[PDB]
Design a protein around this nucleic acid. Structure first.
Lengths: 117, 129, 116
RNA sequence: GGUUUUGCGCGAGUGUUUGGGUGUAAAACCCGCACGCGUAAAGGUGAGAGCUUCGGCGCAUCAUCGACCGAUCCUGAUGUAUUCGGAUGGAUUUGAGUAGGAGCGUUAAGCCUUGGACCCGAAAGAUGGUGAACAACCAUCUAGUAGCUGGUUACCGCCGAAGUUUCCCUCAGGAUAGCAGUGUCGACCUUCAGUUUUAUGAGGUAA
RNA sequence: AAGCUCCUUCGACGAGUCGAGUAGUUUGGGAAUGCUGCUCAAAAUGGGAGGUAAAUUUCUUCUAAAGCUAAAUACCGGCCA
């Protein structure tokens, strides 16, 4: 499979450790900007779509509005205190709702919220 | 032959030991062990615990199993009998399952000291291809 | 399910009269083979035996239809003076002549190369 | 990117290096979930290395008789929702099937395919420009490609050929076997032999 | 000025655009894979795309024809190291 001019389109990766250093320094810069805050936002537990991966779960995009309302977190405050919100996802069942609500109250139990001024 | 193809220095130590034995004793066992020590890895296929468990059946349960290869664990074998095996290498699960059953694990130099001529031994080869 | 009497009565609701004593052969133009076409084919997978069995059934049909049309007097033989349009365009028959002549010269070139 | 062999680690598993952590900072060290490949979803008899308490036990492998399965050929059970099912006895059955796993990763060497592809060597064709004055030149695609030449870099040692059988089809050719070599298995002067002898074949051919 | 709650009140969502026929071009891709040109030219419990032999198109999942937006990505050039 070398029918085309592959010489002009070879990508080497001699900058792999340098890019790893760059990524770690970017994370350090994020830490410097957000000093007591975590560098990541909280994300829900979701089930993998297909039948092949139905058994396992992973991290989602953001919490459903029903999950936030059931956990006692208002919708507008949630992105400002480190929680990700996804308006597209639906719960569709009482078992993902309970799991992500438990995740949200676990996050609330370990949060140090500071006053505005 | 004249030299083993292996670069393992302990393999060459075993080759020197069994050269001496084959020369200074009239035991065909030592000559066969030396010949198999000269042989390559593909010519020394792994012998599983189940194949030894089959061959340890009639009156050989009191004999010492000699394998010039690596004994591997077999998951198909549910119960491991008591066995005294002398081999080049043992995998971790195979050695653990042999010692957990009350059996024992040997190297070839301990065999050469305990059984210099191979009396009451059971020479076993792994399946070809 | 097989509600058989339902299929018979639905056929009766939609049957036309097919009786050789009442309607002529040209009306239906339908002939049914006597052989059931399951004994002539031992296994399904071989194409040659299945195709020759279908050939046998259609040849039986063609013979009996030709005999009945000869009894009827309805014209059967398409004559050479009758020119009509074709089922597929004459480009397609140019192509099929082209492959026949191509394999003909391929076979004769192989034979000539074996002679040479 | 395939394939054969030697070494090595682990082994029914194997592969840390996409990435994350860490660092004395392109090194070294560590690994959370995946993913790739592989594995999963014991019979008789006879030889046979080796062992033997001399009674025998018998590796790997081979031969032979058997066993089981995907599926195929009939016989067509209890049963069946009443139109579904296959129980028993039989087959010259197959398989890249089972019958106590061998693979994964890496290194070294050899071979094959594609990239400029061991080095140098057409006529061409295309794109975009420069000039004239009755197609030419320039740069690039382009290290274009086809055949066919020329050339292809120290020493010593050991082993060493063929220029043929058969098959198929392009003509512009490959495959198979042969000659040379390597590994494994089985015996081991048992056995083997471009040979004589004995019997034997076509020549009773000469005499 | 702002967020939330409640409800004997309301809730406007992009047209020579979808789509049909046809000619090119392109793609692994005739539900034309996408795009474009010509002719015709929509809807409102609507429209698009999928699932399904399962008894009829049951069900599922989104809203086109207006627009903005950092990061992870590329880099034979620029200022350097």
């Amino acid at each position: 499979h070398f029918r085309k001019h592959w010489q002009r389109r070879v990508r080497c990766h001699f900058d792999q450790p340098g890019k790893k250093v760059t990524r770690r320094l970017a994370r350090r810069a994020k830490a410097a900007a957000l000093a007591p805050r975590p560098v990541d936002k909280l994300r829900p537990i979701v089930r993998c779509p297909t039948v092949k991966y139905n058994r396992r779960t992973r991290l989602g995009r953001g919490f459903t509005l029903e999950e936030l309302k059931a956990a006692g977190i208002p919708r507008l405050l949630a992105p400002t205190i480190g929680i990700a919100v996804d308006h597209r996802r639906k719960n569709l069942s009482e078992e993902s709702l309970a799991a992500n609500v438990q995740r949200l109250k676990d996050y609330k139990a370990r949060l140090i919220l500071f006053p505005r001024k | 032959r004249k030299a083993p193809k292996s670069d393992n220095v302990y393999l060459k130590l075993l080759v020197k030991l069994y050269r001496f034995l084959a020369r200074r004793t009239e035991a065909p066992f030592n000559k066969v062990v030396l010949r198999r020590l000269f042989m390559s890895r593909i010519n020394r296929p792994p012998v599983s615990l189940s194949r030894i468990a089959r061959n340890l059946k009639n009156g050989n349960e009191k004999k010492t199993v000699v394998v010039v290869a690596t004994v591997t664990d077999d998951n198909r074998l549910l119960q491991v009998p008591k066995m005294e095996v002398a081999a080049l290498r043992f995998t971790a699960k195979a050695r653990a399952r042999i010692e957990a059953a009350g059996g024992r694990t040997l190297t070839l130099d301990q065999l050469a000291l305990e059984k210099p001529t191979g009396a009451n031994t059971l020479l076993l080869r792994g399946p070809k291809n | 399910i097989n509600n058989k009497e339902g299929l018979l009565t639905a056929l009766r609701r939609i049957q036309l009269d097919i009786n050789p004593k009442t309607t002529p052969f040209s009306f239906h133009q339908s002939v049914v083979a006597s052989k059931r076409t399951e004994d002539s084919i031992p296994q399904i997978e071989d194409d040659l035996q299945r195709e020759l069995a279908f050939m046998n059934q259609a040849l039986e049909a063609a013979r009996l239809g030709r005999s009945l049309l000869r009894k009827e007097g309805v014209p059967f033989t398409r004559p050479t003076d009758y020119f009509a349009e074709m089922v597929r365009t004459d480009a397609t028959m140019e192509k099929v002549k082209q492959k026949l002549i191509e394999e003909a010269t391929a076979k004769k070139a192989a034979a000539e190369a074996r002679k040479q």
